[PDB]
Amino acid sequence: EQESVKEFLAKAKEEFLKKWESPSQNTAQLDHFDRIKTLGTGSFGRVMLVKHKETGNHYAMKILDKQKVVKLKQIEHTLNEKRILQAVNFPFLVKLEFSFKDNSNLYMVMEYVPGGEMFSHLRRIGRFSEPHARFYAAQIVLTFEYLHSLDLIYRDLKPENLLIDQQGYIQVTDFGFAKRVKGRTWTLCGTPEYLAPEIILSKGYNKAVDWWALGVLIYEMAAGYPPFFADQPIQIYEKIVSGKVRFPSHFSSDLKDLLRNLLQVDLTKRFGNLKNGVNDIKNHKWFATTDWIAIYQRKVEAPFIPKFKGPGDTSNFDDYEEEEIRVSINEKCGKEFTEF
Numbered sequence: 001e002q003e004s005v006k007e008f009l010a011k012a013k014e015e016f017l018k019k020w021e022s023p024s025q026n027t028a029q030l031d032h033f034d035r036i037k038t039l040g041t042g043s044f045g046r047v048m049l050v051k052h053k054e055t056g057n058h059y060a061m062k063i064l065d066k067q068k069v070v071k072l073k074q075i076e077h078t079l080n081e082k083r084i085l086q087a088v089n090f091p092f093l094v095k096l097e098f099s100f101k102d103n104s105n106l107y108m109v110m111e112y113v114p115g116g117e118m119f120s121h122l123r124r125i126g127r128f129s130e131p132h133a134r135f136y137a138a139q140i141v142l143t144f145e146y147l148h149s150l151d152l153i154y155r156d157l158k159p160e161n162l163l164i165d166q167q168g169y170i171q172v173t174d175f176g177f178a179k180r181v182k183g184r185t186w187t188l189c190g191t192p193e194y195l196a197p198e199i200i201l202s203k204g205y206n207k208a209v210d211w212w213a214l215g216v217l218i219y220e221m222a223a224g225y226p227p228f229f230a231d232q233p234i235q236i237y238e239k240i241v242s243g244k245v246r247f248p249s250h251f252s253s254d255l256k257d258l259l260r261n262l263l264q265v266d267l268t269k270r271f272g273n274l275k276n277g278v279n280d281i282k283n284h285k286w287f288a289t290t291d292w293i294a295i296y297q298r299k300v301e302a303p304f305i306p307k308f309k310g311p312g313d314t315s316n317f318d319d320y321e322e323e324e325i326r327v328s329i330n331e332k333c334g335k336e337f338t339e340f
């Protein structure tokens with residue numbers, strides 16, 4: 001309710017809407033870049049480290065195969081991802097620098113963050129101390145305050161999507177499930193361990209699912225494993241809907257209290273979804289040592305700085321089979337992707 005935050009968010013929304021209404025398109029092409037390395041791969045796309053041939057800058061180029069996007073029912077999702085990313089601007093979101101398409105693929109050319117995914121660092125270290133988890137959590141809280149004020153739901157919070165930058169701060173990547181939603185939406189998406197009960201139960205759900213996922217993330221960062229862990233998805237889902245969570249004895253009382261309010265099965269009682277909105281989270285005791293403005297301004301010294309040798313270093317990412325980027329001589333799926 002600080003007039004300061006109100007005016008910040010009002011300007012943020014004005015700027016977002018202008019870009020949302022008139023999206024950029026076709027701002028580079030493939031032969032402006034050299035291919036370096038595959039950084040990730042999935043059922044309909046890949047992320048490739050590339051270097052711009054004129055500037056020498058490195059980028060993470062997400063390449064989506066239009067035919068596979070169609071087959072796996074991701075058309076609208078890919079259009080969401082690009083339209084949202086070209087319109088947002090926040091310190092903890094990876095920046096989309098260029099986008100374009102060709103006969104075969106869609107391309108989103110993002111700033112490359114060489115420090116790696118939080119997932120790798122968390123697994124390597126085991127767990128994060130509460131201060132370390134809190135530093136990251138505060139960045140997600142502010143990011144969700146920003147996104148939700150724009151009527152955006154993120155829907156893919158998990159450690160793999162949180163890159164650690166050169167200053168040790170988070171950059172959220174992968175807007176593949178992000179959507180502009182006034183009210184409710186219905187698509188089943190997200191990784192099993194992070195799904196809110198109302199997603200599992202096929203309800204019309206809202207931004208409260210992001211706050212649930214933050215609870216899962218904070219738990220996993222501080223414990224080293226997620227709260228509803230089980231060997232198969234159906235067993236995970238039974239635990240999620242049950243309303244039962246066990247906390248390690250090393251968790252502080254303040255942490256347990258915050259988590260009970262984020263991991264609240266009843267979405268109408270969940271922190272982030274009450275009348276006081278995000279302030280129930282920002283004002284919670286677990287965040288008492290957090291200077292929200294200093295986090296936003298990146299003035300807090302980070303818990304650690306990833307080790308890397310320079311902007312082209314791939315040592316914090318892992319190795320994948322290197323496959324061709326073939327571009328068909330014939331246009332595929334042109335109609336479906338006209339707006340991209």
Ligand SMILES: COC(=O)c1ccc(C[NH3+])cc1
Nearest residue numbers: 039040060094110111112113
């Ligand atoms: C800005 O995006 C990146 O730097 C990046 C994204 C995804 C991966 C692999 N999951 C690696 C790097």
